[PDB]
Structures are given as C-alpha cells and as structure tokens.
Amino acid sequence: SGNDPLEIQFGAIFPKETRNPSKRPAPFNKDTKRILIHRGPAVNNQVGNPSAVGEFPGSLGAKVFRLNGGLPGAGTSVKFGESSTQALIRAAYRQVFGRDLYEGQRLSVAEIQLENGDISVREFIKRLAKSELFLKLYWAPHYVCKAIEYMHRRLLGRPTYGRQEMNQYFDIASKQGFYAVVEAMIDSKEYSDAFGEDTVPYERYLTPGGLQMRSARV
Amino acid sequence: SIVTKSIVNADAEARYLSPGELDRIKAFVTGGAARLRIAETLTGSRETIVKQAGDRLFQKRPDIVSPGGNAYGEEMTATCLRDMDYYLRLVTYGVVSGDVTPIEEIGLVGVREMYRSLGTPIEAVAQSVREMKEVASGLMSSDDAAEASAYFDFVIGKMS
Amino acid sequence: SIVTKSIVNADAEARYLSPGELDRIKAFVTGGAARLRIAETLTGSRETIVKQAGDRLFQKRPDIVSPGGNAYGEEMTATCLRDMDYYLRLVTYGVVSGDVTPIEEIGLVGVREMYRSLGTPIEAVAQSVREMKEVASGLMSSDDAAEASAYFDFVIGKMS
Amino acid sequence: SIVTKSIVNADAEARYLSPGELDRIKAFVTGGAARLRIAETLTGSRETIVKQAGDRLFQKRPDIVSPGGNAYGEEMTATCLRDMDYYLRLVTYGVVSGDVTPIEEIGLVGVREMYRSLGTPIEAVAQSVREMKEVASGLMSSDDAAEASAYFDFVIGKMS
Amino acid sequence: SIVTKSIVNADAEARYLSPGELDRIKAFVTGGAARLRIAETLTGSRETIVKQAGDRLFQKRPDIVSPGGNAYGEEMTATCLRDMDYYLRLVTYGVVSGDVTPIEEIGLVGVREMYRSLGTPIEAVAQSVREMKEVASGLMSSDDAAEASAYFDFVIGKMS
Amino acid sequence: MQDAITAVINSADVQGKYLDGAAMDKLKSYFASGELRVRAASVISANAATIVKEAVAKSLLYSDVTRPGGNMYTTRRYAACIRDLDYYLRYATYAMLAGDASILDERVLNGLKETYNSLGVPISSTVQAIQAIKEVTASLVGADAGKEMGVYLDYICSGLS
Amino acid sequence: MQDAITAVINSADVQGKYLDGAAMDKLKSYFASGELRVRAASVISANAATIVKEAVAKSLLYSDVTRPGGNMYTTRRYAACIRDLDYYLRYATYAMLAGDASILDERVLNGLKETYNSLGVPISSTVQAIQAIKEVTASLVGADAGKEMGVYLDYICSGLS
Amino acid sequence: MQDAITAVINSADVQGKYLDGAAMDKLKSYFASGELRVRAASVISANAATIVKEAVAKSLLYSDVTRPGGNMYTTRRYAACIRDLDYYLRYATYAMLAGDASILDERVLNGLKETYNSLGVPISSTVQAIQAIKEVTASLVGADAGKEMGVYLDYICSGLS
Amino acid sequence: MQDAITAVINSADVQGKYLDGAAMDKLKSYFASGELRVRAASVISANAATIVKEAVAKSLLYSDVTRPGGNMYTTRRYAACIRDLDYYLRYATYAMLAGDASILDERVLNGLKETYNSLGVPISSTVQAIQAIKEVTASLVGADAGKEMGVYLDYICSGLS
Amino acid sequence: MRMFRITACVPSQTRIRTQRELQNTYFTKLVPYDNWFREQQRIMKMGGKIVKVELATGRPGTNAGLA
C-alpha cells in the first residue's frame, strides 16, 4: 500500500513506512493484473477493448492537448498559432510535473526546438521527463519503485498493472538508471498507441482508491 | 452546460475564464428565456409528440412492430414508446443546458452496445428520433424549431 | 478577431461553427458601428489619453521618474509615454477586433522578458494602462466605457 | 495467415518463433489443403451463391429494388450484386488465408462511412451477406460450412 | 575530458558553469604536469607492463591459455596481449583527460557483447587489467600510483 | 463536475422526470444570477495576484511562518504557498461561476488534507490565508458576489480543517 | 491564420499607426458582407455530407479510381477519400467565413503534396473531385457565396497543382 | 508484412479477381514448403549467435575494419555491427518463414541505406559479412533451405548495395 | 563535441597511437592556456546578462529594427532576440573554455542559418549585435581572452553569415 | 550528441481519423543517435516510410568526443 501515491493533480505523496505505520502487505505473484477504472466511457477500457487505446474520452475523461494546429513559422505579427502551441507547452509542463514551474525552470531550448518543428511532442515530454528538475523533484527523493510508479502514472497516464511492468522498469533502473527508465516508458508500445507524436499525455485511468477520493465526497 | 464546458477548458489550462468565455456565458444566461420556453413546449406536449412519432415510425417500419420484430406486441411497443420518451426528455435536458453533454452522457455513450444486446435495430431508433424531431418542430416557431433541431440531430447522428 | 477565434475553437473539435458561434458573429458584425466609433474616440484623443495618464501615473509612481528610476529624465519619460501610446494602440485594435488576441500576440507575449532585459517595473506598466483606462472611460458613455474596459482590464491582467 | 501474426508478435520482442508458434504454423500449413478445397467450392459456385442470395434479399427487402430505393434499376441492382460478389471474394480470401485479416483490410475498414456516403442501408447489406452465407452453407458439409461461416459471420458482425 | 563533461552537464541546465566545475578545471589544468608525467611513464613502459601483467594473469588464469580457451596458443596469446596493450592505451588516454569518458567511448561501451561474440571471458580481462594495476603501482611514485589506480580500478569495475 | 443547471438536470434525470415548475424556477434563478457571477469572476481574474498579495500580507507575513523555522521560510516554500493560494482562488472562482462546489471536491479537496499533513503544512495558517482572501475579495467585488465567493472559499476551508 | 479584420490590424501595426479612415472602410467592407458569409457557412454546415456525396457521385464513382487497382478501391481508401473531401469542404468554409486563405495554407497545404506523393494519392482526380465539390456548393449556396467558396476551393486545387 | 499467401491474395485482389488456378498452385507450393521453412527457422534459432560469431570472424576480423581507423575499431562499433548482423539473421529468417521478402522491405530496408551512408559504415564490408552469414547458414541448415536463406540475404544485400 | 584534449585523443586513437610528442606539446599548450580560459569563463559568467544588455542597448535599440517594421518589433520578437544573444554568449563561452568550436556546430549552428532564412530574422543585424557582445566581453576580460571570445563569436557569425 | 534528422511518412491503417492528422503523417524531426535504432524499428513496424536519414549533428568516423 505504501507504493500507491495520492491521485491528486500534482505532488508525489506516498505513505511513509515509519510515519504512522499503515503497511498492508499482500502476496501478489508475478502474473496479477490490477483492475483500473477508465477516465471515460467504461467500454473503452483497454482490457475489454484493446483497440480502444487512444480513443479520447470526451466529456467523461480528462482534457487532451494535441499539437493539431500548425506550428508558427512552419513574417507578420498577430499570427494566431502562438496561443495554441504555448497552451500545449504549458499543458505538457503541468502533465510531466503536475503543475507549472517557477520562472527560470522551463527547458527553453526544448520549447523553441519544439515550436520550430525540429522535434515532436513525444520528444519534448521525453526531455521534460529526463530533465534534472524531474530527477530532483520526483526520482531522487523516493524509493526506487515509488519513483517508477509515479513516473508511470505521469507518462502513461495510468498506474502499473502489476509485477511485469514494475519488474521491467525496476530492472532497467538496476542496470542503466533514471534516463533509461524514462526512455523505456516513453518508447513503449502503449505510449505510442495511447499518445502519438502530437498528444500531450494525460490521466487515462484511476485506481479504485483515487476515484473514491474524488467522487465520494459530499 | 456551457458554463461547465468553459470551466473545464479553463481548469485544464490552469487559467481564469477568458473574456470570450465569460461573454459566451453572458450570452447563454441572458438568452435563458428562449431555451426554457422551448423546454416548456417540448415537456407540455411530450405525450402527443411521442404518440405521433411512434405511429409514423411504425407505419414507416412495419417490420419492427410486426411478428418477429423487436417491438412486436403490446409490451414491447410500449417499451419502444418509453425509449422515445426517454430521448425526448434527454433532448429537453440538452436544450435547457445549451449543450449536448447531458444527452451524450445519459443516452448515447455505449448506446450501440445496449441496443445490439437487446436486438433492437439502431437504424430504427434513429428514425424514431427523426419522427419525433419532425413532430416537435411542427409545434413551435421556426426559431425554436431550429434551436431544438441541433440536439435532435446530435442524437440522430450518434445512432446513424 | 472573433471570427478567427471561433474558427480555431471549431477546428479544435474538428467540426463546423455552431449556430451559437455564428449568431455571436452576426451580433458582432451588426454592432460593428459602435466599436468602429469607440476605436475612433480612442484614436482621435490619443495624445490626451497618453499624456493625462502619464501625469496621473507619475503622481501614482513618482519613483520611476526619480533618479535611479527606470524613466528618470525627459528622454526616458518620453519613451515610457511612447510605450503608453503603443499599448493604447493595441487596445484600440482589441476593441475593433472583438478579441484580446492581437493585443496578446503583439504586446503581452514575452513582455515580462523584454522589460526584464530593459529594467522597467511591470506593476508600473500595468498602472500606466490602468490610468489610460480611467482617462479613456471618463471621455465616453458608461456602456462604451465598460466595452472598452473589458480589453483595458485584459491588458492590466496580463501585466500584474 | 498465422505466419504473419506469429512473425509480427515475435518481432515485438525481437526474438525467434518459439516451438509452439512453429508447430502452430506447421499445423496451419497442413490444414491448407482443406482450406483450399473450401475456397474452391465457394469460388466455383460464386455465381449461383450470389444470384440466390440476391433473389432472397430482394423478397425480404423489396423496398430497395422498388422506385426510390438504393438498388432500384438494372444498373443499381447490378452494382448491388457486384458488392455481394466482392464480399464473397473477400470471404474466399479469408478462408484461404485462415484469417479475417484480408476481409478487414479490403472490405470492412470504413464500410459504414462508405455506404452512408452512398446512402446504402448497411443492415440491408448485412442481410444480403447473411443470405449469401445461407446459400453457401447449403453447398458445404458441416465442417466446411462452419469454417466458411466463421468468415461470413465476421463480415456480418462488421457490416452492421 | 573533465572539461567536456562539465560543459555538457552545465548546458543540460542551461547555465554558464558553477564555481566548483571551474575550480576543478583549474586544478586539473595545473596538475596536467603530473598527469602527463604518469601518462609518459606508462607509454614508455607499456611493453613491460603488458608482459608482466600477462604472465601473472596466466599464472592466475591458466585455463585461457589451455586448449579451448579464447587465448589458446601463441597467436591468440598475441591477440590477448594486444588487447591488454589496447586497454593500457585507454588508461593513458583517460589519465591525461581527467575523466573516464574516452575509455567508455572506445573500449567499454560494448565490450561485454564483443567478448561474448568472441567467447573471451571478460572477467579474465578484468584480471588482466588488475595485474597491470599492481605492476604499474610499483613502477611510479606513491601518489602517481594511486592517480593511475583510479582509472585502472574504473576499468576493472566496468569489466566486472 | 456539475454546475447549477447540471445539478437540476441530474436530480430530474435520477427521478426520470421532465423539468417541472420548481426545476425551471431554479434554472431561472441561476440565469438571473449569471450576470453578477460573470462580473465578479471578471474582477477576480483581473485582480487575482493583488488579492493573493494582500491576503498574504494580512495573514502570513511578518510572523513566525515566514521566519526561519516556519513553513513559508525559503523562497521555494514561499512560492509553493502563494501558488496554493492562487489555486484556491481560481477554484473558488470556478465554483462561483458554476454555482456548485462539486469541482472543489473532485479537483481540490480530494486528498488535500492528507497532502498537507504529510508535508507538515500548517492547516490553521492556510485557513487564515484563505479567509484573508475572502475579505479582500469581498472588499473588491462587493457584498453579494462577495457573499457567494465567501461561500465557496469557506467550502475550501471546511475541507481543510 | 488570418481574416480580413486581422489583415487590416496587421497592416496597421506593421506600419505603426492607429487605424485610419481607409482601414475603417476596409473593415466595414468585411462587416457588410458578414451576413452572406454566415448564411453560406450555416447552409454548407447543414449540407456538407450531401455535398460530399453528390461530388463523389459525379466525379469519381464508376471509373478506374473506384475499380480494382484504383486508389479508391478498398473500403479504407474510399472512406479516407471521403474524409479528405470533408476536410476540403470544411476548411474552405473556414476560409470563406474569414475572407482570407491563410488557414488553407496553415492546416491543409502544409506538406500535403509530399503526403499524397508518398501514399500515391492522385492529383488529377482529387483536383477533379474538389472542382465537383465547387460545382455542388455553388449550386446550393447561390451566386456570390458560391463564387467565394469557389475561390477558396481553387486555392486548394492550385496548392495541390 | 505479407506472406506468400497474402502476396497472392493481393495479386488477385488488385485485379478484383478470384483465386485462379495459378494462385492455387502458388498457395499449394507454399503449403508444401512450409515443413522445411519451419524446420530451418527452428534450426537457426539455436545457432544465430554461433552463426554470427563465425561469419564475423570469417569476413571481418583482422582487417582494416576493426583496426584503428576502420569502422569497427571501438567496442561501440563492434557491438553495433554484431547487433546489425543479429537482426539481419533474424529478419532473413522471418522472410524465409513467410516466403516473401516484403518484411525485408519494411523493417529492414526502410531508410537503412541513408542511415549507413550518414555514418560512413562501409556498404562493401557489410555486404561481404552478410554473404559470409549466408555461407555459414548454408552449412547448418541444408541445401534447399540454404538457397531460400541465401535468396533473402541477397535481397537485403541488393537493397544495401 | 570535442575539446583540445579530446581532439588530440581522437586523432591518436584514429591513428591508433599513444600520446606522441606533438600530442604532448598540444596538450601542454592547452594546459598553459587553461588559466586565462577559466578566468575569462568566470568573468563572463559573472556579468553575462549585463553584457547582452549593453550590447543590445548600444547596437540594436532605438533603430528601425525595434521600430514597427523591423524584425525585433513586438514583445515576443524582442524576447526571442535577447535569448538568442544570451545563448550565443553561453555557447561561445563554452567554446572559449574548451579550445574548440565543435560544440558550436553541434549545439548552436544545427540548422540555425536555414531557420533564420525561413523566419526572416536578419543575418546582418545578428552579426552586428554579436560584434557588440564580443566588444563588451573583450573590454570586460582582456586582450587575449577577448581575442578568443571574438574568434569563437565570429565562428558563430560565419556559421550564420 | 549525434542527432539524425529523419523524414518519414506514416500511413493510417485500421482507422479513418476525422481530426487533423497531417502533422503525424509526413514529419521531419531531430532524433538522438541513441534512440534512432529503436525509432527506426518503431516507424517501420507501424507501417511508416522513412524517406530520409541524415547526420544533422555529429561527424562520421569519430571515436571520441561524441556526447
């Protein structure tokens, strides 16, 4: 249970093993699969409808940011393509880090290299995830598997299903390190299916506990 | 609702509502009388709308109400008219809200799965909504009919 | 403009402009003359607006025109008033277009960065625009004043 | 076409085919002869299958071939029979390949959109393919009838 | 080099370089004399270092020179001593750099796969670099021995 | 999230009912309040930074909270706290526009108390800061829209204590 | 993208002057024609599906394009072609409602020819289909709106040319 | 990627043709060859590492490709070359299983030539090493399956050369 | 990127030789320059924002470039320009501190001139502003350190020019 | 770091998308060298058509000084 963070907008909040001890060990073998609740139409859950992966959830799920419109300079002022691209950049920051950064923290080179068509949205979020700021905020201060779990939620928009995903990312962490774990998550097939080269990741699934936290209040 | 749509867009953008969105909300709230009048008209004459549209549907698609048809018999036909009533009520929700979201969330997400399970022909459900749209448009001014037609068409297209 | 903004909002969901958007564009086109005159009122009295607002600001923020300030001396006072005139021009563009975008895309994207490089305090630029707003509002009717105040306040909000 | 699926699934992990997959491929290869016999039975009797299925459809759905319908007229009935023959050809492709993949890739991706743009009732095409299945199953043993019915019913499940 | 990695780490955070990095650049530049002293000592004494290391390795690992070993015979012994000389080259390249990067770019990024494709036991190569270490650590002064031992130990750890 | 219109529709739909006189009365009342809500929200969007600034200066500055050892001490923690105040003000404005507190429960108050308890963020000081925001907003926007904004800011406070 | 309003504002700002009388006249020009633009947009919005249907009927069907070996042959190809024509109709509606073809350059032609050449989509037959769409739209909307839509559809064709 | 079966299906479909006698003969030929195809693919699976270990020694080691200045001298390049040859073996095996080089066009020869040109990897040497792998595979697979694997490896080489 | 140390290492490894007499000499020259290199790096880092600020003030401001029509007009164009100059200073300082310009190729001039041609940023005013930057820098550090900075900033300018 | 500048055309199988998809179809993008093998495989196995690959940043024949 300690490896489940709060499903809040931003922050990696885990129960601390020693502070108000609450540990609830359970024997999950290597093959269990965690039941997740889709943020959208229930029938679009990829368990029952694996080809639904990437189907945008509409009003039942989160807002989805896409670089659908053209990028500026793909001279003249009042070019309308400046608001959409910047809204997407700030959305990507809010997705990878949970919230917007303070002044001076944004990866400006990556932003211009994205706004100039030199990279894709996927490449930019990879740069954000591999940034030293992400390492300091979300990788370094945590148990390795807590860091991986929070990473998975931010990048794939869902908690991990079980020991298969967890073990592969954890093994990469053992062998290669943080950048390689980020690479594995963003280069995985499911990322490509759910998010192309032009979609900012978003919350796609919740645990029962997170949904209950959100929807059980008076 | 338009208010919910604008708030969701702003929240996902981590900003306050833009002046355009605030002006859209103003235009929606100040035009509330027309929407509520359209809803009143649809609610008051719901029985005749459903009855006439059901008769037109049955005459146009006799198979669904004849032996072997999904709606054959008294009970199944009554259930068919009840489904039509459900959708007219949902359309009232949509016209009052100024937004098709209540209709979509209450009666169109997974509708094909449900009607395929039941064996109902979805094309006929769409045609029944078409009949109800025609009958309802008959009972109000052209402006009001044009207003409610967008929601009727949303429902029809989601089944077509 | 409102038409361009509506076009992008419609294309964001891959559809046609809704009847609500089209009717809002209709109302904007028909009310065109009122804003085509509000822009003229702001334009014809531009020098009065800029200079009266600048005097009111230097009464509000005497430090900037004082030695060590960003605007001390006649030269920098004149260039600060130059910026005031620029932003009044953008506000006139905004009232004409019906949208806050050309203001944003001309004078508020990276404004903090540029003025950081130059040393200007930004709360004081917001105050300059606010004084321009007050002086302009005093020159026109209450409803016209509110219509222009929407855009003046947008500029104020994007500065402090 | 389990060879393609097995290779694609093996290329996912950048590995070679495991003994189970290779045994599956070999068993599929052996079944090839029976699959070819079924395919040739459907192919040789293409004309009668299509003719009888079309005749049966035109009695269950007489509206289509009467004035105002889609397939009305010798030309449009000819195109309708051509569509039925196309889908029979795709079914033969499926039985030989052992998979519905060619059927999807040639006939069932965007079929609803195509026929809606053409105005063709999709349920009527589904009934026509069901009649083709009935006639064809009238010429095959139980095993072969079930084997071809897999593909016929998949076409029916995607067409409506 | 240490300078290259300082620069790339800085450019990762888009900064001009922090005081500790420049302090280390100063220290390494000033100690260039000692580092080049060690490098020249190893270059001039390379053949003896390799010979003694190989003799003590083979006394430690008499299997690789036995039949079936990767380095069996005299030609394969020549190839193995050549690899020992190559990694001594890389040690001298590293010491003058102040960083391990050249050693990884040339000799360690891919070494495991190379030796497996060759059948060489890479742990025996680790032992060879060890024997090189305990020979070189008596051929030069006490501090120079450790200054080279850093790179010897890095190679050993990266080959373990 | 639900606004006032959607709340009415949900109650009706859960009954399976068409909208009767009382539901239409609720809709009419909300439409009547819409203009006031929009004016107030525009004012808050205009003066959000000032509202937060004045609430902080009123409630938190020049106290142990900002001094070494307090939770707002250090520029990082200062920035995080004023960011949180901006979040709360933005969500209170959302709620006021919608006329429904549901967005607060689904987006803000879910797990917030556990968050602040795990972080060691003092709750009473945060509540005082939010109440200062309420007073500043009341003095800025009026006494009616001030009252509605107060309802939703007090809702945020209720979910934190 | 751009429209007539944005066009005049851009000219003025690049020059560096408040909107002068001539600019106001050029604005009034777009203002006066607004009714026709909105009307044509709404009509074509109502009839877009039928417009595409009729255009494909009299431009592509029963030719080597829809037969085996033609790039409309399979179901996927036919539906994709209908999707492309839907794009052309709605983007020409977008441009007509604005008075400028900037959006046509932004979100339609930005790499279109490379995509067709790589995927083998024909240029002659898609140009013919676009011109058939022009014919059908001109019939439905009227004379002036038909001419404007035709101008923007010609823009798309020439971009493909 | 398409197999021989799907290749024949597409050949008949582009003509809108049923599977004629020649197509049936091709399908029967592939079904007959399936036994030896699967046998060879099983034998390669246990010798791919050995095959590459021997082919590289036969064609690459102790030349100006692995000495200083040759494009294998660094361990990075040696391991990368081993990876390229590993993938060549496995993809030739896939193509042999499918009885069609279509996959070798999609997942092997899609931008490979321009990737090697950008890095100065010698096309001559990689062609020679692929030929060596073909020779080695011939000894452990057999004669006819040897011809199959040689045809597919030669197809790759002609793609590069 | 390569430093002088890595440049000589790369040459020796390409030719497959130990550190030779000329290699020792060139390493020694870098070691003899690596005190003014670090001092200039520290001084440039100390006051880089002022360097760019004064350069822009004396070389770009209050001319047609910043006026309506020039390519610096707009709060956004100005921001883009000042960050471009700031990046130029950072990467030129890296280049100076390493005794090489490969970093300028690999992290600045990767398609910069083509981008400016596409986007219309002048190729003369950029070099003029960089002249101002190198002037202020050289006047801020020294004759030889300034000479190095001017050499590398001219390398950037030539890559642009 | 070595950076390729890859141009590719990605077709759309299994779905007729109605939103704007041209940006995903024919694209030119910078790819780090280390990710280019994986990316080449991903574009290919997706059905893409990699028109062009170049070495935008870096040199051939470089044994050291690549990062």
Ligand SMILES: *[C@H](C)[C@H]1/C(=C/c2[nH]c(/C=C3N=C(/C=C4\NC(=O)C(CC)=C4C)C(C)=C\3CCC(=O)O)c(CCC(=O)O)c2C)NC(=O)[C@@H]1C
């Ligand atoms: C039907 C007999 C009863 C019923 C069902 C119902 N379920 C949901 C939603 C979900 N159902 C599941 C269940 C599973 N997902 C899995 O992966 C597995 C393991 C194989 C199971 C059993 C889940 C996870 C959901 C959430 C959405 C999702 O599918 O991801 C609903 C909808 C609830 C809602 O409020 O939308 C319903 C209605 N309800 C009844 O009343 C029946 C008795």
Ligand SMILES: *[C@H](C)[C@H]1/C(=C/c2[nH]c(/C=C3N=C(/C=C4\NC(=O)C(CC)=C4C)C(C)=C\3CCC(=O)O)c(CCC(=O)O)c2C)NC(=O)[C@@H]1C
């Ligand atoms: C006056 C309200 C405040 C103030 C302003 C101030 N600004 C400058 C210098 C510049 N201001 C700009 C701004 C713009 N140029 C544009 O094109 C746009 C879009 C319309 C904007 C907003 C620029 C570019 C400059 C540089 C000089 C130039 O215009 O060529 C100064 C002078 C600074 C100096 O050192 O000379 C001043 C004083 N300063 C205050 O204190 C007021 C609060």
Ligand SMILES: *[C@H](C)[C@H]1/C(=C/c2[nH]c(/C=C3N=C(/C=C4\NC(=O)C(CC)=C4C)C(C)=C\3CCC(=O)O)c(CCC(=O)O)c2C)NC(=O)[C@@H]1C
């Ligand atoms: C002096 C060079 C400049 C200046 C200073 C100034 N600051 C304040 C108020 C505060 N300053 C801080 C700063 C910090 N708190 C921290 O924890 C850290 C790091 C440890 C810093 C740097 C804070 C928190 C405050 C708020 C008051 C409080 O401490 O509780 C003021 C007063 C502002 C007011 O209106 O009260 C002033 C004057 N002002 C200048 O003009 C100089 C350039």
Ligand SMILES: *[C@H](C)[C@H]1/C(=C/c2[nH]c(/C=C3N=C(/C=C4\NC(=O)C(CC)=C4C)C(C)=C\3CCC(=O)O)c(CCC(=O)O)c2C)NC(=O)[C@@H]1C
């Ligand atoms: C300000 C009045 C008080 C205060 C605040 C404070 N908060 C934090 C840190 C965090 N705040 C949050 C809050 C939220 N996350 C959400 O998703 C939501 C809804 C959108 C909320 C409100 C979180 C998660 C954190 C931790 C992560 C992060 O800060 O980014 C701090 C800093 C604590 C630290 O050092 O980590 C502070 C200072 N502190 C006071 O003293 C005031 C009373």
Ligand SMILES: *[C@H](C)[C@H]1/C(=C/c2[nH]c(/C=C3N=C(/C=C4\NC(=O)C(CC)=C4C)C(C)=C\3CCC(=O)O)c(CCC(=O)O)c2C)NC(=O)[C@@H]1C
């Ligand atoms: C018969 C059971 C039903 C019917 C058929 C019908 N179809 C059309 C027109 C077309 N049909 C197709 C379909 C395909 N083309 C292909 O290549 C394949 C995949 C192998 C298929 C399935 C196409 C493309 C057309 C367009 C015409 C053309 O080919 O040029 C018609 C004519 C419609 C009209 O008005 O022109 C008809 C009648 N109609 C029914 O009512 C039956 C349910």
Ligand SMILES: *[C@H](C)[C@H]1/C(=C/c2[nH]c(/C=C3N=C(/C=C4\NC(=O)C(CC)=C4C)C(C)=C\3CCC(=O)O)c(CCC(=O)O)c2C)NC(=O)[C@@H]1C
């Ligand atoms: C129809 C008149 C002709 C025709 C069409 C056809 N198009 C494709 C494939 C694509 N078409 C586009 C075009 C666009 N996508 C966009 O988002 C926009 C900009 C708003 C445009 C203009 C694209 C990008 C593709 C590929 C990606 C995709 O389809 O999703 C095909 C090829 C089908 C295939 O899969 O090979 C076809 C058939 N072909 C004809 O012969 C007609 C003349």
Ligand SMILES: *[C@H](C)[C@H]1/C(=C/c2[nH]c(/C=C3N=C(/C=C4\NC(=O)C(CC)=C4C)C(C)=C\3CCC(=O)O)c(CCC(=O)O)c2C)NC(=O)[C@@H]1C
């Ligand atoms: C000696 C301690 C061990 C040993 C060595 C050995 N190596 C080979 C063959 C090769 N070794 C290399 C070496 C390198 N490749 C690089 O990239 C670098 C980095 C600078 C080095 C050092 C290479 C390239 C080869 C291939 C042959 C060639 O160069 O042409 C052998 C021969 C293997 C065989 O049988 O072919 C041997 C014996 N073997 C041991 O058992 C020792 C532990």
Ligand SMILES: *[C@H](C)[C@H]1/C(=C/c2[nH]c(/C=C3N=C(/C=C4\NC(=O)C(CC)=C4C)C(C)=C\3CCC(=O)O)c(CCC(=O)O)c2C)NC(=O)[C@@H]1C
């Ligand atoms: C070995 C026989 C020869 C050799 C190889 C070599 N290749 C590279 C670099 C790359 N090779 C590939 C591989 C592929 N691209 C494809 O499309 C396919 C289909 C699966 C394959 C196998 C790639 C992608 C690269 C570049 C990116 C990368 O490696 O991730 C090198 C390295 C060159 C360099 O480091 O600059 C080498 C050494 N070289 C020889 O001399 C042999 C003859």
Ligand SMILES: *[C@H](C)[C@H]1/C(=C/c2[nH]c(/C=C3N=C(/C=C4\NC(=O)C(CC)=C4C)C(C)=C\3CCC(=O)O)c(CCC(=O)O)c2C)NC(=O)[C@@H]1C
């Ligand atoms: C300032 C002296 C001049 C000036 C600058 C200017 N540049 C742009 C746009 C871009 N500049 C870059 C910069 C770089 N590309 C690289 O690879 C590197 C290495 C990090 C740099 C520094 C890029 C990528 C762009 C395009 C994308 C982007 O927006 O960043 C502009 C913007 C022009 C416009 O918005 O249309 C400007 C203004 N302009 C002048 O007039 C000066 C002479």
